Amino acid sequence: HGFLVTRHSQTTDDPQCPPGTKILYHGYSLLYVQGNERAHGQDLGTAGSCLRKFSTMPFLFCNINNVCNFASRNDYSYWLSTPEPMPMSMAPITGENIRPFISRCAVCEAPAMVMAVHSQTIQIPQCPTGWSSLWIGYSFVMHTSAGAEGSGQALASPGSCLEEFRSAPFIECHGRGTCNYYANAYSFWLATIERSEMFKKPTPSTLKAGELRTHVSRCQVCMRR
């Protein structure tokens, strides 16, 4: 019937289409854009989060006087990033130096429905009976950055299942041509919840390097057989 599934490598390499699916096209991983200070995202599980061409400013805007402006104000674009570390200067990255930071994606056609399930535990949730595994990962639900604006993922969409946990899974770019990580770039994930504690006051926890991914909910993307 024309089912599609999008996958993000989180590296500069094109990701392979999941078992049982066929490639349509590859691109760069778009998380969301911000125009006139308003954020609008593209679900990572849809083809909309995979654009053939990258740019710190992938859009333009027009007014009722029939005048359009491209990269002529103060807008943003956010993309899933790679493991490339911040330069020692911690200063904004520009031009060709940006290339190594942008994640790649693949839009694939699937023979049937594709969905994600979350365990809300450190264990991988099993696929529903009769469904096959496409991939596993971590429960990525939403994010915020400049102005506390942002967007998120549908919990049954493959986009809520990132294959590699990253405290900073995306990078911020600007129309002026710069990109960088900022202290306020927040990534939100489904937490691990013990069934016995569902109706108990949450126990606060502060996590540091090495103990982060061990307390995040896991997920599996599945496809009907």
Partner 1 sequence: GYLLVKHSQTDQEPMCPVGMNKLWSGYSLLYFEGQEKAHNQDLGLAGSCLARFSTMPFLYCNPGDVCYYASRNDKSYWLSTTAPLPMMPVAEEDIRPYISRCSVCEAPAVAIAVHSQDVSIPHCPAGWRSLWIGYSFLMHTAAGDEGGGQSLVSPGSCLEDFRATPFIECNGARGTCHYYANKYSFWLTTIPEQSFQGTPSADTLKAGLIRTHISRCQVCMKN
| Residues lying near Br ion in the complex (CB under 5 A) | 24-25, 63, 71, 73, 75, 164-165, 175, 182-183, 210, 212-213
Which residues are CB-neighbours of 29 under 8 A, at least 6 positions away?
8, 9, 10, 44, 49, 50, 79, 80, 102, 103, 104, 105
Report the first-to-last Cα separation within the chain, whole angstroms.
14
Angle made by CA atoms 9, 189, 100, in degrees to the nearest 5? 30
Least Å distance between CB 25 and a copy of itself?
7
- Which residue from 105, 106, 216, 219 is in contact with partner 1, where contact means CB under 8 A? 216
> Which of a copy of itself, partner 1, Br ion, none sits in contact with 89, Cβ below 5 to 8 A by type?
a copy of itself
Residues between 37 and 66 that touch a copy of itself (CB under 8 A): 37-38, 40, 42-43, 46-49, 51-66
Q: Is 136 in the site for partner 1 (CB under 8 A)?
A: no
Q: Report the residue from 14, 84, 149, 163 that binds partner 1 according to the rule CB under 8 A.
A: 149
Yes or no: say if 81 and 169 are a contact pair by the CB < 8 Å rule. Answer: yes
Largest distance between two CA atoms of the chain:
60
* Residue nearer to partner 1 on the CB measure, 16 or 68: 68
Report how far residue 90's alpha carbon sits from residue 103's, in angstroms, rounded to the nearest whole number.
20
Closest Cα partner for 115 from 101, 129, 97, 134?
A: 134
Contacts with a copy of itself in 153-212 (CB under 8 A)?
154-157, 160, 167-168, 174-178, 180-191, 193, 195, 197-209, 212
Question: Which residues from 162-181 bind partner 1, rule CB under 8 A?
Answer: 167-168, 174-178, 180-181
